[PDB]
Amino acid sequence: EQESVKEFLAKAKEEFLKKWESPSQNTAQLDHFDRIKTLGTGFGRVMLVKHKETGNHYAMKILDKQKVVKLKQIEHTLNEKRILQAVNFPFLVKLEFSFKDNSNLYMVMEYVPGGEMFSHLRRIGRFSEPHARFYAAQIVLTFEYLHSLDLIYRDLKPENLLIDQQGYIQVTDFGFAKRVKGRTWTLCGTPEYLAPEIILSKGYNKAVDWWALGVLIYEMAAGYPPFFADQPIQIYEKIVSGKVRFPSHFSSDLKDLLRNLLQVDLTKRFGNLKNGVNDIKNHKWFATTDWIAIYQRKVEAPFIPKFKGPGDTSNFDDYEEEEIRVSINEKCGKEFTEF
Numbered sequence: 085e086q087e088s089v090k091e092f093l094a095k096a097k098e099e100f101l102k103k104w105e106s107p108s109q110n111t112a113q114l115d116h117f118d119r120i121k122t123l124g125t126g127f128g129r130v131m132l133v134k135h136k137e138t139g140n141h142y143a144m145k146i147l148d149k150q151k152v153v154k155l156k157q158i159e160h161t162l163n164e165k166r167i168l169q170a171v172n173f174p175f176l177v178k179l180e181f182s183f184k185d186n187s188n189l190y191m192v193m194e195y196v197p198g199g200e201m202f203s204h205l206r207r208i209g210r211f212s213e214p215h216a217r218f219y220a221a222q223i224v225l226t227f228e229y230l231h232s233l234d235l236i237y238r239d240l241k242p243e244n245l246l247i248d249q250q251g252y253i254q255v256t257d258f259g260f261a262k263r264v265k266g267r268t269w270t271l272c273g274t275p276e277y278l279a280p281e282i283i284l285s286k287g288y289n290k291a292v293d294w295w296a297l298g299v300l301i302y303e304m305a306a307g308y309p310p311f312f313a314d315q316p317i318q319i320y321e322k323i324v325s326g327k328v329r330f331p332s333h334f335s336s337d338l339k340d341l342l343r344n345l346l347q348v349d350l351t352k353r354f355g356n357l358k359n360g361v362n363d364i365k366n367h368k369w370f371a372t373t374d375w376i377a378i379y380q381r382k383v384e385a386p387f388i389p390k391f392k393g394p395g396d397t398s399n400f401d402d403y404e405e406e407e408i409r410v411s412i413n414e415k416c417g418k419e420f421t422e423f
């Protein structure tokens with residue numbers, strides 16, 4: 085559909101609000117699926133499952149209700165599921181089902197077989213600037229979409245970006261995402277990717293996602309993130325200084341974009357100025373990017389992950405296989421009424 089960015093975002097917001105104000109609930113149950121393999125573990129696990137009637141594969145995120153309460157994650161788990169059931173964008177993973185039982189919360193999403201961007205980045209070492217720019221353009225469009233809905237993402241990093249069968253990104257986890265008008269205050273995220281105003285316990289806004297994009301672009305093009313150290317306290321000291329050194333192989337345009345995204349003063353940071361996302365989209369580093377062609381998935385990707393079929397797990401790693409235990413008695417019912 086050929087139309088302005090403004091009209092596209094206006095309709096996107098109308099559609100999001102309809103699902104936001106009436107969330108879907110209870111759309112499957114656990115014994116509708118066969119368990120295949122644990123894909124990741126950290127109050128929660130991600131497991132490859134297969135729907136018994138259709139044969140379709142899904143990634144099932146399982147959260148232990150007792151651990152969420154103790155780790156003070158209740159509102160974040162409610163945010164994640166409510167946001168995931170309401171969004172719709174080419175680079176966002178689709179939630180197909182959600183439900184809960186006596187012990188756990190379950191979010192059943194499309195399974196993306198290509199693996200995490202993190203794995204591919206670490207195998208190759210670094211991405212060339214055109215390869216990094218292909219991925220970065222998808223994040224810029226996704227953040228323009230999310231921010232226009234008043235959503236902040238708050239966990240951009242290579243482990244949260246999966247690569248699909250066409251070589252495009254799927255942003256998968258929404259565990260820290262939140263609908264925010266104005267400012268928000270929770271400490272969350274991952275140390276290497278935190279903006280200075282999060283570290284300093286300030287009231288912060290969507291500018292923290294544009295800072296995180298600067299960290300991601302740096303890490304994709306260098307092979308390592310710009311602020312790193314053995315301990316979080318030392319990482320935080322480097323972030324708040326904002327002193328950054330760039331590899332000599334970085335182009336001048338890449339360095340300029342990064343100095344404007346990794347701007348410690350949030351009131352001067354690209355993405356947070358009067359022209360908003362257009363200061364990023366119009367930057368010289370993106371001069372070759374065809375934004376419509378990226379959105380429509382018409383650009384050939386830099387590479388296609390190797391995998392054998394929709395159930396192949398070869399691009400994910402191996403974890404001890406543990407039970408999914410469901411109590412005879414219901415736990416934490418009041419806390420998760422809305423889920």
Ligand SMILES: Cc1ccc2c(n1)N(C)[C@H](CO)CCNC2
Nearest residue numbers: 123124125130143243244256257
């Ligand atoms: C499909 C899949 C596998 C492994 C993981 C995963 N998803 N995700 C996105 C989690 C966050 O939920 C973080 C990355 N590591 C484990």
Ligand SMILES: Cc1ccc2c(n1)N(C)[C@H](CO)CCNC2
Nearest residue numbers: 155156157158159160161269270
């Ligand atoms: C009762 C309540 C309201 C709002 C919030 C909340 N609890 N908590 C504790 C979360 C963490 O889950 C972050 C702080 N801001 C939102």
Ligand SMILES: Cc1ccc2c(n1)N(C)[C@H](CO)CCNC2
Nearest residue numbers: 085087088089092225375376379
């Ligand atoms: C440059 C331009 C114009 C119009 C649009 C556009 N880009 N994109 C890529 C959006 C998403 O941002 C969807 C396609 N239609 C509207």
Ligand SMILES: Cc1ccc2c(n1)N(C)[C@H](CO)CCNC2
Nearest residue numbers: 187406407408409410411412413
């Ligand atoms: C294997 C399995 C099944 C069911 C349960 C279980 N384990 N355990 C041990 C839990 C967790 O302490 C408590 C008992 N209720 C359900």
